[PDB]
A paper describes a structure:
A series of analogues of PBIP1-derived peptide 1 a with phenylalanine replaced by other acetylated hydrophobic and aromatic amino acids (2 a–f) were prepared and tested in the FTS binding mode assay. Interestingly, the pocket turned out to be very specific for hydrophobic aromatic residues. None of tested aliphatic residues (2 a–d) showed ΔΔTm values higher than 1.0 K. To confirm the binding modes, we co-crystallized two representative examples with the PBD, the leucine-based peptide 2 a (ΔΔTm=0.3 K) and the most potent ligand 3 j (ΔΔTm=4.1 K). As predicted, peptide 2 a turned away from the pocket, corroborating the result of the assay.
The PBD domain is responsible for the proper cellular localization of Plk1 through an array of phosphorylation-dependent protein–protein interactions mediated by the phosphopeptide-binding groove. Disrupting these interactions has shown potential as a strategy for anticancer therapy. The discovery of an auxiliary flexible pocket on the PBD surface, which is involved in binding a peptide derived from polo-box interacting protein 1 (PBIP1), has been recently reported. Our objective was to prepare more potent ligands of the PBD by improving binding to this auxiliary pocket by optimizing the hydrophobic interactions whilst retaining the key hydrogen bond.
Numbering used by the authors:
A (entry chain A): 372 to 594
B (entry chain B): 73 to 79
Write the structure that this text describes.
């Protein structure tokens, strides 16, 4: 799931000690063409009873249920993707009345209602990169929480890490070999990892990339 | 840890 490539990319950037450079030129590592197609804009952990609900930046919503099934509702509020335990996938609509999914659809709508009522949309002011017209939406593969962060792994290979204390977030893509950093002031910047290696970066980003490698190691080992 | 994203 591209995790191995992610780990190697992070190992390489971190080994270069990017914050120990004197004349840091972080802006030279920016590549707005590498902005992600998707990131997680909201989430709610109700895994003690139902599962983990989330919103993607395109306003689609999803749930990773406790039975290890996944349901996605598109931003049109009708189109569905349903992914079974084995990875089997169906493309359906709510309006067609899929009898056997109506319960799970209802649960997803309750997740959707809670998120709309209560939660802020991360990166709301940023236009995501356009994907291929015939590309399916990714699902949440896995997630875990530490004392300091939530780690979210999408089926397109992206790894997202949200830090609780200061609301800073990383979105890592192994296909672009890029990192998006959303800072304490909500500033959204996308960098090529190889260019961070060459040009350097601030202590704040470097520290978070070190933590990211530890998290990616955990994702890799828990497979 | 928290049970939801930023409210």
């Amino acid at each position: 799931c591209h995790l191995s490539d992610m780990l190697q990319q992070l190992h390489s950037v971190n080994a270069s000690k990017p914050s120990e450079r004197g004349l840091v030129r972080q802006e030279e590592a920016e590549d707005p063409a590498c902005i992600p197609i998707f990131w997680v804009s909201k989430w709610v952990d109700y895994s003690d009873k139902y599962g983990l609900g989330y919103q993607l930046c395109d306003n689609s919503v999803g749930v990773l249920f406790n039975d290890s099934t996944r349901l996605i509702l598109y931003n049109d509020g009708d189109s569905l993707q349903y992914i079974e335990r084995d990875g089997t996938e169906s493309y359906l609509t709510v309006s067609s009345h899929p009898n056997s999914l109506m319960k799970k659809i209802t649960l997803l709508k309750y997740f959707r209602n809670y998120m709309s009522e209560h939660l802020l949309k991360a990166g709301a002011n940023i236009t995501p990169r356009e994907g291929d017209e015939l590309a399916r939406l990714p699902y949440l593969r896995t997630w875990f929480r530490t004392r300091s962060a939530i780690i979210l792994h999408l089926s397109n290979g992206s790894v997202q890490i949200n830090f609780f204390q200061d609301h800073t977030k990383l979105i890592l893509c192994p296909l672009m070999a890029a990192v998006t950093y959303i800072d304490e002031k909500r500033d959204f910047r996308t960098y090529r990892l190889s260019l961070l290696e060459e040009y350097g970066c601030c202590k704040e980003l470097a520290s978070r990339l070190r933590y990211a490698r530890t998290m990616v190691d955990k994702l890799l080992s828990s497979r | 840890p928290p049970l939801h994203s930023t409210a």
